[PDB]
Design a protein around this ligand. Structure first.
Ligand code: DTP
Lengths: 150, 356, 356
């Protein structure tokens, strides 16, 4: 009966699954960690039209408090959730864009220094994109990811 | 062959737990198995009144619960009411006729009593949540998913009561009633008693705990405050129930009380294993029906079924059976939350010995 | 033919008190006989813990009792312990199989429960008064005087349980076992159930009250303070017991619940009368053997026997039986204590009208 506001700005009826799928993911390969815990801890308070971004941010801070001596893994769990959330505001999707397109767009926005284009060539950027390993964002911890995010 | 009083002056301390001699005198100054005596004193201290519980705000919280959610709650509540209604009478009826010791006799009656109180609490919770309680009660009998479990509970108790009657009317031996031949062997009668306890255990150890998860599930959501309190109290009393059953099984499987029973226990081990797996499985199926409309925040078909296995292993390993499900970390740790100037001193000589 | 959970969706309101259909669901939102429902709530409120009671000074008060006065006390205590031993288990065993209504199912179990507590209190009183409790307990079994009692109580409970077993294993009609011929008629099964209740009543109405007189007898002497309290609490709970049994007999003798039973009740009226007189008499003979060695201020063998008659008439007239003993006043009214500057005004004209 209730609705939610997706990132793009589309709206669809609330679906618990969307949250279950996500949490179940970052919990993959972890132990002593329970999905149900985060959901209830979150005491997430649905209310007609709620932005999907807020819902994601609430669950992250939840699994963040879980981190404890008994169940440390949680601090990889939250970290994984944070990066997923960051990839949304940064590229609108999990799969990152080409190293060269990313620098170009930014330069036009005034984010990166324009010298990057005067020192390196397009043919080189594509050569550096190979060294990159976005799969290394999971090697981070909530404490680390939180810092980068801020 | 049963008597509410046995004339013979038998020694209560030597007499076995079951199939012995009908308890004549009720003394508690000495017990063969202090384990039971402790359960009595411990159970009596947990005496609660379902009334004291304010269950008033639950009427509005239930109306707010989403149509799929009402299902989860009411359905889980119906099943619980079913069990404790059976385990309200079953105990005394199938246990008293066999018991031959006081410490255990009183236990069973006190154990069956606490169950009636539980059956009373549910009735107090329903009337507060719904308008017409009859709508719920009349269902527990007609419902499809509810009946099988009730039928399963019925099979083992009755099967034990039937023979117990023949063991008193007929004794060991083959007898004919209207052309028919009845074989009454104490060896067989012991299997039913053992197998029965195995079911009572799984029911009060796994079956019931599988429902508490859903009951306390709403609690974590600050929903149904009243009903969670009541359910919480039942859990405490429930623990004592599953505990007593376990010890009885061990004492029989260890040949402590009766040398023959350990043998018998070894023969049914395989059948007893399939029993737990039978119930443990039925628990999963219900989770699917309990969620067929949808899911809650931090509980669902998948996450729930996981708990079923986790607890089954602990309960089975307790009585002495191989772990049917794979070893796992607990899937809902939250269920445990409901289950219990400056010193100024200066010395020159002390520091003068320190070389820079 | 008994089930801990009847599949059929029968109406608990229409079903008779006994011989109906095994109670399946445990609901308390509606009762056919609110009388029982009231007994439950009332009984649960009187929940007491034999331990809370201070019986410590009773150890010195009893040591002081001259061996004969120690006779009166210890002897009376032994009988009581025997009475609630049986009332411990008999109810659920005999009562439960037959009950077909949920209000009453739960009453009986709660009624039998309260009895276990009583059996517990006695054990707590003995250990405090004597050095070796075994000396007392081992006697209830061997004392002959206890024996006429014990056997009699067992007989009626057992006689009812025996048939109840056949009514489920065989059912109505004539059946044969090992050549022997067994006649199972529901009409006869109802007599045993009725006659049994008649005994349970007299026991919990006359038999028990005949012992309280001696228990409270020491109380009036400021002796055995602790024991006086415990026994007093048992009396309160006891009242509810005899009440439920009465209500149960009337409904059966009035043909309210079962039309047939009214008739059956009329056939046993004579046999039921001899029953009360039987027990009422045994009460007298025991009292003689209360004092064989002496009497102590308040109790007499004479004065006590008088109370036996006084109460028997009230209890018998309650169920609907002719008064066997003469009409008399309460021989021990003290027992009821345990059961529960002026105005100066001058007028000349007002008096001037008065002629002398
Ligand atoms: N319809 C929904 N109802 C409830 N929660 C939702 C719903 N849709 C998404 N969520 C949850 C899932 C995540 O935990 C969180 C964030 O979703 P997120 O993936 O970041 O944005 P998104 O909705 O635009 O992408 P996606 O379509 O893949 O879910 O919100």
């Amino acid at each position: 009966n209730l609705l939610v506001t997706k990132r793009d700005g589309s709206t669809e009826r609330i679906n618990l699954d969307k949250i279950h799928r996500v949490l179940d993911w970052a919990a993959e390969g972890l132990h002593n960690v329970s999905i149900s815990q985060v959901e209830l801890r979150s005491h997430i308070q649905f209310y007609d039209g709620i932005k999907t971004s807020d819902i994601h941010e609430t669950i992250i801070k939840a699994a963040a408090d879980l981190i404890s001596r008994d169940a440390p893994d949680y601090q990889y769990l939250a970290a994984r959730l944070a990066i997923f959330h960051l990839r949304k505001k940064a590229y609108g999707q999990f799969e990152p864009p080409a190293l060269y397109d990313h620098v170009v767009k930014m330069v036009e926005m005034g984010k990166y220094d324009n010298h990057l284009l005067e020192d390196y060539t397009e043919e080189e950027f594509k050569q550096m994109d190979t060294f990159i390993d976005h799969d290394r964002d999971m090697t981070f911890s909530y404490a680390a990811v939180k810092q980068l995010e801020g | 062959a049963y008597t509410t009083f046995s004339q013979t002056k038998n020694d209560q301390l030597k007499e076995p737990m079951f199939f012995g001699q009908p308890v004549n005198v009720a003394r508690y100054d000495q017990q063969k198995y202090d384990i039971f005596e402790k359960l009595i004193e411990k159970q009596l201290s947990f005496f609660w009144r379902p009334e004291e519980v304010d269950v008033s705000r639950d009427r509005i919280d239930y109306q707010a619960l989403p149509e799929h959610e009402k299902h989860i709650f009411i359905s889980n509540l119906k099943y619980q009411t079913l069990l404790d209604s059976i385990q309200g009478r079953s105990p005394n009826v199938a246990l008293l006729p066999l018991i031959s010791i006081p410490e255990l006799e009183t236990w069973v009656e006190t154990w069956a009593f606490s169950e009636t109180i539980h059956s009373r609490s549910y009735t107090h919770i329903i009337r507060n949540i719904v308008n017409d309680p009859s709508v719920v009660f009349d269902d527990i009998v007609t419902n499809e998913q509810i009946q099988k479990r009730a039928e399963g509970i019925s099979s083992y108790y009755d099967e034990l009561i039937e023979m117990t009657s023949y063991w008193h009317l007929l004794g060991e031996g083959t007898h004919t009633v209207n052309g028919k031949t009845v074989t009454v062997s104490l060896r067989e009668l012991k299997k039913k008693l053992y197998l029965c306890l195995m079911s009572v255990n799984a029911l009060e150890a796994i079956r019931f705990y599988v429902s508490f998860a859903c009951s306390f599930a709403f609690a974590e959501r600050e929903l149904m405050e009243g009903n969670a309190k009541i359910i919480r109290l039942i859990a405490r009393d429930e623990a004592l129930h599953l505990t007593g059953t376990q010890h009885m099984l061990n004492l029989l499987r260890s040949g402590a009380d009766d040398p023959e029973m350990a043998e018998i226990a070894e023969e049914c081990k395989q059948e007893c294993y399939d029993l737990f797996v039978q119930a443990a499985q039925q628990e999963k199926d219900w989770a699917d029906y309990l969620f067929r409309d949808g899911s809650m925040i931090g509980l669902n078909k998948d996450i729930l079924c996981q708990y079923v296995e986790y607890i089954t292993n602990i309960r089975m390993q307790a009585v002495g059976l191989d772990l049917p499900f794979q070893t796992r970390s607990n899937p809902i740790p939250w269920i445990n939350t409901w289950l219990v100037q400056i010193d100024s001193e200066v010395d020159t000589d002390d520091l003068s010995n320190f070389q820079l």
